[PDB]
Amino acid sequence: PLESQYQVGPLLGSGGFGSVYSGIRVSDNLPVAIKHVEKDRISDWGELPNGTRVPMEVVLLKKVSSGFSGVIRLLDWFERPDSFVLILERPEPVQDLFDFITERGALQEELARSFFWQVLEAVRHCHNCGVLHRDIKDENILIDLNRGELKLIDFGSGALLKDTVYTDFDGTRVYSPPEWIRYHRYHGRSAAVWSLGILLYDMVCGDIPFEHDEEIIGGQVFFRQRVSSECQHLIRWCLALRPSDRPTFEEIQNHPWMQDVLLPQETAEIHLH
């Protein structure tokens, strides 16, 4: 009984991911988000341990929702005749990182460092859980404004993580790496690192660096805002044209620009209240 277990509120957003409503769990007034996905519009399907055929998104969310982390957790899900319904955490108050950057402009590097660090820890958690997000971008990151915590959303273009080549891609083209543009092939970790370079530039410059294929493959990063030399180096490293030239997650987090990160509560108190 989904209609008699959650109170359904206003529409929060819609798009390629589906339609998402604000909601409240009747059992305990817990704020939730209710995401509807049309069966007829589902690209990749998966299978649960029960054998039931569910969208890949549900499989991936179950794999990463164990415990606490910087991923929005799947609390429950339901199957309907023509759709699946997902019950997700809802931070309140919340703003997605795309809107946050639109309103604030380029972020101070101390704030970008804290946000970027938290995204790295969240992506590490996904990979440790066998999950590749494949659509890391500011639009798919929520900010819990009171806690200063970032949360990954929209695993609908993701995949099980593997070490062999990927030849399919459903994420955002302007965050996708040049080997995808040129050859329609990529490996998961180095492609993730590329999208993280795009995201970090986005944070410290106020918008993404590339809009067209020729810029993505061209391999030149122009900085439109004042950005420290250490931060420029990290970005350009993540945006290396050759995938094997890109840093690992460990090399990113050991980079000099990443040291002395703020705690999330400090981030909220200094930058978000």
Binding site: G15, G16, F17, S43, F98, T102, D135, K137, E139, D154, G156, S157, D170, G171, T172, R173, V174, Y175, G206, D207
Partner: peptide
């Protein structure tokens, strides 16, 4: 101008 980019 700054804009969102749909997925897919």
């Amino acid at each position: 101008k700054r804009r969102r980019h749909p997925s897919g």
